[PDB]
Design a protein around this nucleic acid. Structure first.
Ligand SMILES: [Mg+2]
Ligand SMILES: [Mg+2]
Lengths: 181, 201
DNA sequence: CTCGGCGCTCGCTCGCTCGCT
DNA sequence: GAGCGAGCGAGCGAGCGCCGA
């Protein structure tokens, strides 16, 4: 398994759940999700271009925070060296503003932000390990959890199913537990 | 507001000999009547080369920039090591991304026209001012305050000559009491502005 | 003193711009 | 038109001095 970049996108504050989902449609907010579906889809479209990675592994999760909606994008680093992630990410940020926001930049502070190895300045683009998904994304539960997308086989059935998340989390803790022997 | 590129050109202390007529040796400079400078401290032959450099640089600038009437301020100086010219030219018509290629056009022309195709020995004789002192910054844009801040304060013998089409510095180029006046006037504003900022928390 | 996060520097990277041929 | 390539400069990030704990 490869490393991942994390880009977090804040989203300003009629879908169906797939048959296999156990989630509560009543707790998923329609309007913000529609914005998020465009952002993730278009991000990944541009991502595939700059990285020359048509099959790029990704996991995206849309969450409802205490102050704003935020979307975690995890893309495989293959094809995009850390040294050039910035110049490519700025191209993508611009596409979104044009395609989704009619070319009016969102008011939201820090609304499109890569995850660095440090809080201040001078850090590096963080290569997030894939265990980030069970350790930190899978355990989210409604209403905080709002939606998720992936092309990673392990998580197809997990995106929108709370039981399957629960299982994979536990499957992970077991594996962790196994290495400690 | 007008922004300015800054090119800095070194001039040597040097088919030019005193044993025969030539465009450098033959020139003799007078101060305009309004000037309070000391002509004995101004070096005639470097001055003469320096005048030709800035003159030609400018007309080549008006070509690439497609901007006749482009604002400029140029000042020739005698330093510890070399003579040098600070050329300030308005950015209009030249996007920073293409300054280089145009500056190299001009640099080559000056080498052919003034140096007869023999590239100057001097180490970094034609260099544009960047936003950082090392590699990888952009071409610097300064505003007019750079003139009262860093060029007007010079006195002789460091100050040799100045040329400008800028209304406000016409009389200052070669009048020292004029420079002094404008420097005080500027510093006063800068000082009040400093106070005002400190008091604005 | 030790410790550690933060602000910041600077040699360096490398996809992009665009006048030129 | 096509595409070369010097010049571009935002981005990078290990390293380090500072400062409050
Ligand atoms: Mg999270
Ligand atoms: Mg000087």
């Amino acid at each position: 398994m490869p490393g991942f970049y994390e880009i977090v996108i804040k989203v300003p504050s009629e879908w169906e759940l797939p048959p296999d989902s156990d989630m509560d449609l009543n707790l998923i907010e329609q309007a913000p999700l529609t914005v998020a579906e465009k952002l993730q889809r278009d991000f990944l479209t541009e991502w595939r271009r700059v990285s020359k990675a048509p099959e790029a592994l990704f996991f995206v999760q849309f969450e409802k925070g205490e102050s704003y909606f935020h979307m975690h994008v995890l893309v495989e680093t293959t094809g995009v060296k850390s040294m050039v992630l910035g110049r490519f990410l700025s191209q993508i940020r611009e596409k979104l503003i044009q395609r989704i926001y009619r070319g009016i930049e969102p008011t939201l502070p820090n609304w499109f932000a890569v995850t660095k190895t440090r809080n201040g300045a001078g850090g590096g683009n963080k290569v997030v390990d894939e265990s980030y998904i069970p350790n930190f994304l899978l355990p989210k539960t409604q209403p905080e959890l709002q939606w998720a997308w992936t092309n990673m086989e392990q998580y197809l059935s997990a995106c929108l199913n709370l039981t399957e998340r629960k299982r994979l989390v536990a499957q992970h803790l077991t594996h962790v537990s196994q290495t400690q022997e």
